[model samples]
Target: VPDLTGSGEYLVPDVLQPGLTLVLVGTAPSGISARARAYYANPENKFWRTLHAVGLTPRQLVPQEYATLPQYGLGLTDVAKRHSGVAAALPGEAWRPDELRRKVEHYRPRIVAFTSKRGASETLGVPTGKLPYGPQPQPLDWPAETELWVLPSTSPLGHNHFRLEPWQALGDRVRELRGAAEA
Candidate 1:
């Protein structure tokens, strides 16, 4: 494979902090996100809207405000950090499970939720056929305290096969975690 490295551009920064209640992971930013230098910048994606719709956040949040997620006990990241575009389209070098493992272990969030099953499968080495939407088992070599969840992609494409039920389930769990933390 030709060297696809040295893109030099850092696209969007990871929105992460230690011990958040949840961390939403994706394959990488879409071209729009890279242009905006933020996660989920496409208004059509409905990411911010879903968070509020599902009660994960008190109010709708703009993608530009993603950096403030830790305040809500939430965070965001991607398995492939060096590239932007669709999950299948990114070059191989752009997919870095190592970086994701390091981030999840280091940050130690109570839950690591993949925004797309493609992201979860790529990072966990599990086939998408075997993965299901909603909570997942703790994978080998990951921290025991860190739960796993595979959410439907919030991409507009996600709406094709989407049901809002799993996202609602995640919201319920996040609320329970928040309640646990408060006490």
Candidate 2:
């Protein structure tokens, strides 16, 4: 078992805002991330890699640059507050449903994209593997304006064996969201 004492605990940002049209919602930060006080701080995590692959960033940005999302009108958050040693350790109740609802209400980004199917199920209160990468009945309890999306996790542990182009589909969705206002 990993020593959680040195590993630290997960945290949720107060709020991520600027209501562009897209927001990425990930599961809790990992133990390594809890120590770093930043979401997706784990070096092995592929959040940054996904961002670069999708053209969201000029180049691969470091974990420290996670906060720079607001500059581009993107936002980030997690489904749970506490870290569960690994994702498998997470239980349904581990998710703070209210926090996620509140984030959608507060940030109001057009689309809330979950990093994984599991994360989306927890937040949407659906069975663990049903919903695909699009809107569901859960209706984020915020403004009716927001949409929901699920993207394959970019974590090293997530769908890593899949081709990059498939993963890039999520990025393409973001690109669509960014231009949502044009119409």
Candidate 3:
């Protein structure tokens, strides 16, 4: 089986604003994205489209420009740093809670948001079967002020399972957090 754990380089948390409220955490870069050195770089991935749909950007940003998130005060990370042929090839044990803890500790974003529930549960070391979308109860381990939210996965795999309205709601929540911070 293809090793689904992230093995290649990934975009780190350096792009974030110190007090930014929404930090997006993805499961892992797709093989295509990892090879291209961009998050959600796969042409078929709906991430960029979803970002546009939610008004995160003025217009639909291409995957190649994902590194520009710092200008927008957004940040990105992966629950698993290992890469594989596909997400389905990932093994449960490959998820590293330590890496997530380190990132969370270092970044200390006000809101820790996951693109997928699977990624959230894995990062949180919780059972996948029990995790669900929306704000989770866990607080940040380091700064002690971060909140958690599991947004709908923007992957094509989630298209039918998770609807767009919920995804839009996540964008709304992120906006709210940003507004509250500025207020």
Candidate 4:
């Protein structure tokens, strides 16, 4: 799969555009997504289902329909694009948040959320154990009015360890954010 029009190519091409309300940042495509060429394509993965369950979308979406996210004032990406695999085993070099940082700096979305603690940790330059779930404190240095959030991983591997409360809270914020501002 190739991204022909200038945003440049990635292991799993990014689904991002300017003026987004929220951008979901992930650690990497997980092998399932890389092989399927669709983000969170694993049948057991809850990313898509969670979005609808949380009311972020009017209806449930299949991973392939990811291109339409920005229409809902949402966007998606991962920290590293050169490699795609289970986050637990990703090489140290595979945790590159610089690219993601550049994107957020340029796009200036209302908020950007890292879907897993690992991804959030890398982006914040903090140890994974030190990061907390949900919206971080203000003044994180993202473009003004832009906030940073960390949500639980929707991967099957995180099932027992993560809770949905934070995700649900994020949904509330999403609705509020979208209601107050139009992307």
Q: Over the full model, what C-alpha lDDT does candidate 1 score relative to the true structure?
A: 0.84
Question: lDDT tens digits, residues 1-183, model 4?
Answer: 223122454766787777888899988888878887778899998989999988888798998888788888888888878788887788888876777777787878888988999888888888888888988886566787788888889999888777888888888898998887655
Worst 10 residues of 3 by lDDT: 1-10
Instruction: Using lDDT, rank the candidates from best to worst.
Output: 1, 4, 3, 2
Instruction: For candidate 1, list the clashing residue pairs, or say none.
Output: none
What lDDT score goes with residue 30 in model 4? 80
The digit string of per-residue lDDT tens for model 2 on 1-183 reads 212122444353433655656677777777777666667777877878777877766678777677787776677777776654466787767677576776577657876777778788777778756776555454636577676777766677755543455346656766776676566
Candidate 4: give the clashing pairs: none
TM-score top scorer? 1
Candidate 4 segments whose C-alpha is farther than 4 A from its true place: 1-9
Root-mean-square deviation of each candidate, in angstroms?
4.0, 5.7, 4.8, 2.7
> 23-75 in candidate 3: lDDT tens per residue?
78787777777677667887767888887898766678887787677565677
**Candidate 2 clashes between residue pairs 3 or more apart in a chain or in different chains:** none
lDDT of 2: 0.67
> lDDT tens string, model 1, 14-125?
7777779999988899999988878889889978898999998989989889888888899888887768999878998998878788777788899988888899899888
**Against the true structure, what is each candidate's TM-score?**
0.92, 0.79, 0.81, 0.91
Worst 10 residues of 2 by lDDT: 1-10
TM-score of model 3 (CA atoms): 0.81
